[PDB]
């Protein structure tokens, strides 16, 4: 019977694989960044890698729906197909910092589900600069869900469970009232 | 064990099985009713069976926290251990009608999760004035947090178990989170 509108699934970590696990009805958003590609990273898979001038040009022409400066570099979510996908019932995964999560929760509250991935302790976070991570963590209370990341695989499972639950939310169903009126009509 | 175990009052409704399968960190609640015991049913297991006078006496002295008339008979949820169980991190399963669900959603919004279990069709419902009654109950599913179409009992049980697990990770249900983060991830 019932179709569901997509969710914009926003995941934030400080520590920074799990997303990989999660994707293996959701598509991965690829962000634009001004930072250099690191060993093993590939254009179009990890990020779209551009310079500061091009990043600003893309913002100026409407192609970036969110952006922030994160530890000295720009990062932004491309506008392309996002809202499209929500209408189609396709969810999108965004792995962004708290500034980005806050922006999504403010601008698209009804379609966003936010999850903060917490390290199990500071000592474990250090083993995985930390002042920045502590400040990021202090924004956890604004997120819909929080998960302590002991094991990556378990975290991925719990995120998958949250996504599946959120897809069954009544407020995300399309045409429920019409469905009830047609299939379970009150007579008289 | 950085975050503390969280307890939900899980309200399930259908048109007046799935419950049993879910239970076999949540405990059953046994309701009071004024209807007659049916074949196979046992006091203290299926319901506390009382007469109308005694039911109204239990409502006066505060021992019943919710009550409704459901198809000519009274039903109610005993107050005993519900609030204390939420404090212990222990979830409670309430299998109640829409009047009960609405009451819990208004009385204890922050602790309640409601799920409406829809039959797959009116014919399936009918083979399980009465249909007019069921359609009216069903009309209320728009006010529930979640709606699930019951195609397969076991699938429905797994989906409910998934929703329960997800809701237990909601940030708003962790108590003392801010103080936890301040102690374990201090900003310096
Ligand atoms: N606000 C925002 N943050 C992003 C975006 N893409 C990545 N990030 C965040 O930037 C931080 C640095 O990522 P890294 O440089 O380690 O890949 C991480 O928190 C990551 O989630 C984005 O499009 N917008
Ligand atoms: N409001 C309310 N409904 C209840 C309670 N206990 C059972 N019910 C509901 O009353 C209806 C009739 O239950 P039955 O008589 O078939 O066992 C069902 O929808 C059941 O969920 C209760 O404590 N409160």
In CATH terms, the superfamily of the largest domain in chain A is P-loop containing nucleotide triphosphate hydrolases
The helix/strand order of chain A is EEHEEEHEEHEHEHHEHEH
| N→C terminal distance of chain A | 25 Å
How many strand segments of chain A?
Answer: 11
Overall morphology of chain A: globular
**Spatial order of the strands forming the largest sheet of chain A:** 3-8-2-9-10
| Ligand names | guanosine-5'-monophosphate
User: How does the helix and strand content of chain A classify structurally?
Assistant: alpha/beta
What is the name of the CATH class of the largest domain in chain A?
Answer: Alpha Beta
Protein name (chain B): Guanylate kinase
Organism (chain B): Anaplasma phagocytophilum (strain HZ)
Enzyme class (chain B): transferase
Function (chain B): Essential for recycling GMP and indirectly, cGMP.
What this model shows, in words?
It is classed as transferase. The entry lists the keywords ALS collaborative crystallography, emerald biostructures, guanylate kinase, ATP-binding, Cytoplasm, Kinase, Nucleotide-binding, Transferase, Structural Genomics, Seattle Structural Genomics Center for Infectious Disease, ssgcid. It forms a dimeric assembly. Crystal structure of guanylate kinase from Anaplasma phagocytophilum. Chain A contains eight helices and eleven strands. Chain A is α/β, with parallel strands linked by helices and 188 residues long. In chain A, the strands form three sheets. Chain A has a five-stranded parallel β-sheet, sandwiched between helices. The first copy, chain A, has a four-stranded mixed β-sheet with strand order 5-4-7-6. Chain A has a two-stranded antiparallel sheet with strand order 1-11. Chain A is globular and about 70 Å long. In chain A, 34% of the residues are buried. The A-B interface holds A 1-2, 116, 118, 120-122, 125, 131, 133-135, 137-138, 140-141, 143-148, 158, 161-162, 164-166, 168-170, 173, 176-177, 180, 183-188 and B 2-3, 116, 118, 120-122, 125, 131-132, 134-136, 138-139, 141-149, 159, 162-163, 165-167, 169-171, 174, 177-178, 181, 184-188. Bound molecules: guanosine-5'-monophosphate (5GP) (2 copies). Residues 16, 31, 35, 66, 68, 70, 75-77, 95-97, 99-100 of chain A line the site of one guanosine-5'-monophosphate. One guanosine-5'-monophosphate (5GP) binds at residues 16, 31, 35, 66, 68, 70, 75-77, 95-97, 99-100 of chain A.
């Amino acid at each position: 019977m019932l179709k569901s509108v997509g969710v914009i699934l926003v995941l934030s970590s400080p520590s920074g694989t799990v997303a990989n696990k999660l994707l293996e009805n959701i598509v991965k958003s690829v962000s634009v960044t001004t930072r250099a590609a690191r060993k093993g990273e590939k254009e179009g898979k990890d990020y779209y890698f551009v310079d500061r001038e091009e990043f600003l040009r893309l913002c100026s022409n409407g192609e970036i729906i969110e952006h922030a400066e994160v530890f000295g570099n720009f990062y932004g979510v491309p506008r392309k197909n996002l809202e499209d996908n929500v209408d189609k019932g396709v969810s999108t995964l965004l792995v962004i910092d708290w500034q980005g999560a806050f922006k999504f929760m403010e601008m698209m509250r009804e379609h966003v589900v936010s999850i903060f991935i917490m390290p199990p302790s500071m000592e474990e976070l250090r083993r995985r600069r930390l002042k920045g991570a502590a400040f990021e963590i202090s924004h956890c209370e604004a997120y819909d869900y929080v998960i302590v990341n002991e094991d990556i695989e378990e975290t991925a499972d719990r995120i998958s469970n949250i996504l599946r639950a959120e897809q069954m939310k009544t407020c995300r169903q399309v045409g429920l009232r019409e469905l009830l009126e047609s299939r379970f009509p009150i007579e008289d």
